[PDB]
Every structure is written in structure tokens, then in C-alpha cells.
Amino acid sequence: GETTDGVYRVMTRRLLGSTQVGVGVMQEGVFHTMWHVTKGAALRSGEGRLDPYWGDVKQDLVSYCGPWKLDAAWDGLSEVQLLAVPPGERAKNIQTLPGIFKTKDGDIGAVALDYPAGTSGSPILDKCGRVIGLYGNGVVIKNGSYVSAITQGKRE
Amino acid sequence: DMYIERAGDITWEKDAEVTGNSPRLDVALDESGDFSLVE
Ligand SMILES: NCc1cc(Cl)cc(C(=O)Nc2cccc(-c3nn[nH]n3)c2)c1
Numbered sequence: 001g002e003t004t005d006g007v008y009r010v011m012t013r014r015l016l017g018s019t020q021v022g023v024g025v026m027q028e029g030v031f032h033t034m035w036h037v038t039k040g041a042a043l044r045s046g047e048g049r050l051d052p053y054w055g056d057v058k059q060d061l062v063s064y065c066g067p068w069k070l071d072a073a074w075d076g077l078s079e080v081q082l083l084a085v086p087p088g089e090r091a092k093n094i095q096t097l098p099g100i101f102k103t104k105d106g107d108i109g110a111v112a113l114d115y116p117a118g119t120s121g122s123p124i125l126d127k128c129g130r131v132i133g134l135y136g137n138g139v140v141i142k143n144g145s146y147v148s149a150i151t152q153g154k155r156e
Numbered sequence: 157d158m159y160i161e162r163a164g165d166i167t168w169e170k171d172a173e174v175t176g177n178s179p180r181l182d183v184a185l186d187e188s189g190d191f192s193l194v195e
Pocket residue numbers: 036060114115116117118119120121135136137138146
């Protein structure tokens with residue numbers, strides 16, 4: 001299968017035609033996506049197979065072929081880019097200044113950009129091109145709009 | 157049966173379209189991984 005670093009669409013042929021259920025990041029031989037995209041199922045890459053390695057429903061994250069590799073963090077001050085990969089549309093960078101999710105266990109960066117559900121797993125980057133988290137798990141605020149957490153895993 | 161297809165490189169684009177606001181929201185995260193607003 002294709003193991004070159006980069007952003008990938010996650011597709012299924014179970015429904016009508018070929019449907020994009022999400023997106024993920026290939027880095028250092030490991031595929032990273034959100035748990036709600038695959039539900040922890042195996043993935044195909046050409047003629048090859050990718051098996052889940054680590055996952056956690058509460059964090060809404062999953063890694064394939066190896067442990068979670070992404071460890072960059074938002075600096076709390078700078079604008080970032082969502083590399084949105086929407087269903088049936090070209091990958092496109094959107095720059096934004098994150099807001100904050102304030103929780104009882106600490107603060108998390110949040111991006112107030114609204115894309116179709118099939119865009120879940122698109123990476124959010126810092127100015128160095130490092131993935132600081134994945135887009136797609138958030139909340140609907142008092143205007144019908146969407147705000148996603150910047151969801152990042154832990155590198156063991 | 158799910159499959160992956162490459163969509164691009166991961167790079168910062170100089171002079172990309174800049175949009176979106178920066179809301180500060182009080183939120184709760186449950187055991188099922190769902191975020192909700194705290195009011
Ligand atoms: N258009 C707003 C928007 C954008 C994006 Cl990128 C994602 C969503 C969304 O629904 N995310 C989500 C989070 C957690 C569980 C699930 C889910 N569970 N099962 N099937 N999906 C789905 C919504």
C-alpha cells in the first residue's frame with residue numbers, strides 16, 4: 001500500500017457509490033485519524049492492510065500500524081491552518097486564530113470552521129507545518145455553527 | 157470495507173484564505189467522547 005507521508009481521504013463502498021467518511025494523517029509509517037471515522041475497523045491501502053494499533057473513544061482518536069506519532073501543540077497565541085479535505089473536493093488550507101474550549105481538566109484550542117462531517121480527521125497545522133491535532137470533534141453553539149476542538153494524542 | 161487515498165502533502169500555505177472567529181467556550185467532555193456546552 002501507499003505509505004508516503006501526507007493527508008489521505010478515508011473512503012467506503014458500503015453505501016451508495018464511494019463515500020468519504022473522513023480523513024487522516026500518515027506520518028513515520030503510522031496512519032492517524034479520529035475514532036468516530038473508522039470505529040476502529042481495519043483499513044485497506046491499495047492491496048495492503050492497515051490494522052488498528054491504539055485507540056481511545058473518549059479522546060476520539062485511533063492510530064494504525066504503530067503508536068500515535070503526532071506531538072506538536074498549539075502555542076496558544078498564533079494563527080494555525082486547517083488543511084481541509086472535504087468530500088469530492090481538493091485539499092485546501094484555511095488560516096484561523098483558534099478560540100478556546102475551557103474544561104474542568106484544562107483548556108484546549110478550538111477552531112470555528114464548518115465543513116461536512118466527512119472532513120473529520122483533517123489535520124490542523126502550525127507555521128512549521130507540524131500537525132498540532134485533528135479537526136472533527138466539537139460542539140454546535142447558539143447560532144447553528146460548528147466549533148471543533150484541536151484534538152491531539154500523546155506520543156509515548 | 158474502508159480504504160485510504162492520498163489527498164496531498166501537509167504544508168503551511170503562505171497567503172492562504174484567513175477566516176473564522178476565536179470563541180471562548182465553557183465545555184464538558186463525557187465518557188463517550190462527546191463535547192457539550194456548560195451553561
Ligand atoms: N458539519 C459539522 C461537523 C463537521 C465535522 Cl468535521 C464533524 C462533525 C461531526 O459530526 N463529528 C462527530 C464527532 C463525534 C462523533 C461523530 C459520529 N459518531 N458516529 N458517527 N459520527 C461525529 C460535524
